[PDB]
Design a binder for these strands. Sequence first.
RNA 1: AGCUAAAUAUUGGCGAGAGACCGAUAGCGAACAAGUAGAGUGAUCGAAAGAUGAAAAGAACUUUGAAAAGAGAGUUAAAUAGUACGUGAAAUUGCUGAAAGGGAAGCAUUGGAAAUCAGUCUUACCUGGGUGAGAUCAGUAGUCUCUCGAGACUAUGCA
RNA 2: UUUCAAUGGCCCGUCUAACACGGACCAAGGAGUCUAGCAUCUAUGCGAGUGUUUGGGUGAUGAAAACCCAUCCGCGAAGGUGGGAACGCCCUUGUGGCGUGCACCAUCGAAAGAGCAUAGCUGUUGGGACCCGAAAGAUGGUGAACCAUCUAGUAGCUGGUUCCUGCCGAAGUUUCCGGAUAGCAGAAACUCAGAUCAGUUUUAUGAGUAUGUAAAAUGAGAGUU
RNA 3: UUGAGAAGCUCAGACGAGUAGGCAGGCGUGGAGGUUUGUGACGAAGCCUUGGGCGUGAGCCUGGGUCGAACAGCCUCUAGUGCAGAUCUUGGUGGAAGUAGC
RNA 4: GCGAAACCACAGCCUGGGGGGCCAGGCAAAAUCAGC
RNA 5: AAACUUUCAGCAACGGAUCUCUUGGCUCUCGCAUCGAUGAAGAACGCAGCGAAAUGCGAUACGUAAUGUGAAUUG
Lengths: 328, 123, 49, 136
Amino acid sequence: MAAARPTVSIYNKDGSVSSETLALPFVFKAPIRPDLVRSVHTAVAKNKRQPYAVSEKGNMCRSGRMFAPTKTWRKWHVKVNQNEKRYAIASAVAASGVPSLLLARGHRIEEIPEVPLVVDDAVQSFQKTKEAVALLKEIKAYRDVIKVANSRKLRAGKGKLRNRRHVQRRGPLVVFNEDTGIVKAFRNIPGVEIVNVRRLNLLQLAPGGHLGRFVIWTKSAFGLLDSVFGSTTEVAQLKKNYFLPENIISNADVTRLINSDEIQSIVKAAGPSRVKRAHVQKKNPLKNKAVLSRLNPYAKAYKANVKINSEKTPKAAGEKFLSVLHEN
Amino acid sequence: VNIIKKRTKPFKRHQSDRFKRVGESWRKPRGIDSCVRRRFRGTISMPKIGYGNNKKTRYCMPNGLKAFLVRNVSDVELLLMHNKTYAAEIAGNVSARKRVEIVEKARALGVKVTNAGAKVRSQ
Amino acid sequence: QDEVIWQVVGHEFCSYRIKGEAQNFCRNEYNVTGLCNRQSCPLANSRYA
Amino acid sequence: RSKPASENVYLKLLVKLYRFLARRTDSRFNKAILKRLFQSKTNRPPISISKIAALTSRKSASSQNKTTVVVGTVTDDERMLTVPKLSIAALRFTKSARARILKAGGEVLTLDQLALRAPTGSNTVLVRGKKHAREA
RNA sequence: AGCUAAAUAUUGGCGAGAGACCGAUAGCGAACAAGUAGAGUGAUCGAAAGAUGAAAAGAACUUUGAAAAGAGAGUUAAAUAGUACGUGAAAUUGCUGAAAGGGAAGCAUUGGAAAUCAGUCUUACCUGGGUGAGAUCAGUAGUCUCUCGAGACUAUGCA
RNA sequence: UUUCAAUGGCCCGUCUAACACGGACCAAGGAGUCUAGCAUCUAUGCGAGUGUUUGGGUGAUGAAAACCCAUCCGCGAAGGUGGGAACGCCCUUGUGGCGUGCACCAUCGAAAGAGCAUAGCUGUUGGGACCCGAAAGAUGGUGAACCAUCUAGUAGCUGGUUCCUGCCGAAGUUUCCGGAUAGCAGAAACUCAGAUCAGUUUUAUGAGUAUGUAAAAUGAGAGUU
RNA sequence: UUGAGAAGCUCAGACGAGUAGGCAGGCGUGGAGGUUUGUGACGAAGCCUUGGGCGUGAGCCUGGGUCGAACAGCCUCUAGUGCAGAUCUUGGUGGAAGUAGC
RNA sequence: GCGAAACCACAGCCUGGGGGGCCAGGCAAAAUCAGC
RNA sequence: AAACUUUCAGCAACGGAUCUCUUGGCUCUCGCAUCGAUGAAGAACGCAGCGAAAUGCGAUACGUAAUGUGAAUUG
C-alpha cells in the first residue's frame, strides 16, 4: 500500500523499451504472507491426489494382513474458503512484483531489465519456439531457462518406478490474454508455464509453497489485472463481491517508524548496549588491601593497639569480695 | 580458548555389550524395576544435560576450527571470511577430480581442508 | 518492503541459506560476510555495499 | 504470554513496534497495547460501530478529538442509522464499517498510524469488546 | 390390462489411461511352472521360488584321479561376476596371528605394557635498496555497453 | 584397541521380598491407524453475517487440476451509584487533587448482537478400532465327524505395545451417594502491593501446666474463579 | 565497538532426584512440491573397519577396503515412519553330541 | 558307517550370615573316563 | 609350556539381510455390450523336427485359406 512505482515500462519483442507505460495494478500492493500461502497451497496441492488402498479381502505373521488396511474413503481432498484462496493469489501475485522475493525463490533473473516484466502484445502471436528463445534472450530471461535445462536429474528413489523419473526447476511463467499461438510457441521450452490471466493457479504462482514466482506479463494481460482483483475499496469486475484485503500495519516497514521523528522525540534517555560486566570476582576485603580501602574509608587511621595503661596499674580487689571468693 | 570435553567415552546402551540384537546407541531404560533407572552406584552412567560442553567451544575440532561440508567448488568460497574459525570438510561422495580442485582453491583462501589427501596421490 | 523481505526469506525459506550447525551461511554472490544475518543478507538489506 | 500464537508476519511487525514502545517510554498505554496483541482471537472480541459511538458520545458527549483504540475488529451495527464523526484505530475493519465511518466522519487507522499520531497514547480511549457469550 | 429411451448402478466381460500405492517375508495365494507342485477318500486345502556378464566370450588345451571334481591354464574391465553366479550383513563354523584363563566370565572408573592413528607445521610471514616488467600512471590519443563519468577494451609511453 | 592391576558392579522385561512368567542366538516383519459425530484450545478468512465443489460454466500447455457461479439451503441473528483498564488537567514535583471511566464485579432500576467456514492439537463416543489369545452358534456342503462362509464369534481379562533430551510433578485419606464433591499437581483470565496471608512463636481475654479466642514477633508477595 | 537472524545480542541471580501424569524442543525412515548454476563410472547407494571428528543424546560427518547405478542437504506436505521382549511370524544357524540310538 | 531330539537368561565347589550371584571365610591348577 | 576354553584381528566357509531394479500387484478413472442345441464354459486325449509342472492347435492338429507388411527362423 504505502508507496510504490506508479508506471511500469512496457517492453518490446526485440528487447528495447517502449514509450507507452501502464499504471501499477492494485494487486501488487496486497499483503505478502509467507504463511497464508503455505496453508492454502498445502491444501490445494492435495486436490489431484489419486487414491490408493490394498485389497479388502494377524499383522505380525508373514502372509498375514497389514494392520488396519488403508481405505479409499480416506479424506484425500480438503476444503478451503474461497476468500482465503482468493487471498493467496492476491498475495502471490504481489510477490511476483518484488525483485527480491524472486531471487530467494531460486530464479536466475539477475540480468532481467525490469520487474514486473511486461512484454508487448505482439508476443501473443509468436508461432514457433525459435521466436520464443529469441525473446527470452533479448530481455535476458533465458538464464532461468538454462537453470531448468542444466538441472534435470533422475528422481531419487522409487518415483521413477512410478512414472516420474526426472526432477527439474521452474522457469518463468508467461501470463497471456488471448491464445493466438503464444501457448504453442512457449510450451516446449523447459520450465516455462503458460496460464491465462483469469484462471491463475496457486500451484504455479507459489510452487512448493515458496512465493516469488518469476512472472513474465503480457501487456494485454497486465491491463486485466485491475478487473480480476480490482482494488482495496473497489469491486473486482471479474468477481462478484471481491474486495482486495488490507493490512494490519499501514506502513509495510516497522523498523522505519521506530527511527522516525514521531517516536525518537518522546522516548526516554537510552541506556547502553550490551552492558559491562561489573563485579566479576568476589574480592575479599580482609585478605585484599585495596578493596578494603574501597569499602571502608577509615583504614588510614585505626591505631588498633593504644597504650591506655602503664606500669602504674592498681589492684582493685575488695576484701569482702575476696572473702566471698575464697569462702569454701 | 582451549577446547575441552566433559566426557570422552560415549554412552553405551545397557546390556548392549552382551546381546548382539541390542545396539550400542543409547536408549533410556523404561522400567522402574531397573537397577539403572534408579541409578544404583556401580552401574553405567547416563546422558544428561550436565555433560553439555561449553557454548563457545562447541562443535569445534580439537584444533579449534569447526567443520563445514564443502560438496563443490563454490561451497568453499563462503569460507573466505571465516578461515580462522572453520575447517572445510569435503563431503564423501565428491569425485576424486572435483576434490582436487577444491584443495587447490581452499589453499588460496588459507582454509584448512581436513581430508584433502583422499584419492589424490601426489607426484 | 524490507522487513517484508526478511520475514519471508529470513525465516521461512531462502534459496541461498545453508543450515550449518553453529551458524547459517548465505550462498549469495553479493554477501559481505558469508552468513545469513539480518544486517548481512543482501535481499532484506536494501541499501548494500 | 510472551509471543503471539499467530504466524501473521504483519503482526510480528506490530509486536516488534509496541514492545519497543513499551520499554523506551513511561506510558502504561504501550504496556497495555502490547499486553493485548498476544491475546488469542477469542480473547480479543469484536466491538460494533454503535457501541463505539455510544461510549464516547454519552453523558456530556466528550468526543472532541480522542481516537478510540480497540485491539480487535471494528465490526458494524446497522441498527445505527446515522454515524457520528468518529475516529477509530484497530487492526481489522470490516468492509461495511470502514465505509460507514468515511461516508460521514473521520479516520480509520491501524496501530501503525496510531503510533505516529499518539506515540505515547495521549488523548485516546482504550476500549475492549464484551468477552461474554452468555454460555460459551 | 400393457408398453417405453435419458439422467442412475457396475470388485464381472472386451479394451484404455493413470497413480504423493507395494518394491520379491511387501503388493493378488500366485512378478518365476501358480490354483502349478503337493495334502486329503471327498467337499476342499494349497506353497517355496526374481537379478552371471555389456556381450557366454559359460573356461580350449595339459595333467592327477574309476567317478565326482582338483590343479595348472585361458576369456573378461571385473572370476574380489564361474550358473552353489549383482552387492553378500548378522548369528554360526574351521585355520592363522597375538593374548588371557588356580572350583566364573560379562561391564563401568583410573592408569601401565604392546600395537597403531591423527595433528597444516610445512614453511610461511613481514621489512629496505637496486635492477627490470605496466596500469587502475600518462601537463596522453580511440571503440563499445551503460550513466558529465562508471566499468570493458584496443593502441603508444611506461616518465 | 587387546590385556593387566586397584575398586565397584546380584539378569533383563512383565508382574506383586523372592518368585512365577518370557528369554538359545541372528536377521527381516510386527502393534492407538483410517472415517463419521460432539466438545475444548489455538491459527486463518470474512463478520450480522457466514459457507464455491449437489450441480452449472469453464479449462488446447495431467482437462479428475485451477478458475468462475445462478436458485435453494444449513448455522446465527437502551438506568443511576461504587469500584476498575487507560488517558487528560493539576500543584503538595510527586503524593494527592481533578475529569472522562472500557471489560469484569457489587449496588439499588426495570440491557446496543458474535458468529460462520477451514485447518491443527488433545479428548470423547461409534465403527474391526492398538496387536494377539478366550469353549460358541448359524447356513450351506463332504463322508459316514469333517470342510469352507458369515467371523476380522467372545475379556470383566492374560501377554506385548518400537527414538533422545529438558521442565513441572502428586494422592495413595476423606465426604456423601461404582458415581460425587473437596484436597494434592496443573492452564489461562482477572484480581490486590497490602496486614492479604503463614503444619510458627509471643502478649491479652477468658476457660478447669494444659483449652480456644484477638491484636505483636518473625519470615514470604498473596487471591479469585 | 560494528554483538539488528529483536525468532538476534547481552548482564545478573537462584535452581537441578523423580512414579501416575502434564508440557516443550529436537533425531531418524519411505514417498510429494520447491530449492542447492546439488553429488555421481576419476565410482552413487550399500557393506565392513585394531582410523579420525562432532553432538548431553537420539544421530551425523569423514579416512581405508569392498562394490557397481543411482543419490542426498535445506524449507514445507505426507505416513503402512523407529523394536530386545508378545510360550511373537518367516527364514538361518548353534550347545546338547558324533552323545541318544540302528 | 549312519545319526537325532528334548532342552538351552548366564551358569556350575563348600561353611556361616542376609541363593548359584551378596558379605566374611575354607580354599583354588589343566584334559578325561567308569560306578554315583 | 603345548592342547582345550574364552577374547581380539585377518582369511576361508555358512547364510541370504541391506542397497539398486521391476514385462508383477493393488487402487482410481474412461469407452464399450459381445456366450449356448449353428453344440457354450469345463474335461480327456492327441498333435512340435529335436520339449521336459508352459503355450498354441484339432487327424487341414505349436495350424490352412484371404489380405497386408515385406526376406526371414534359429539352439
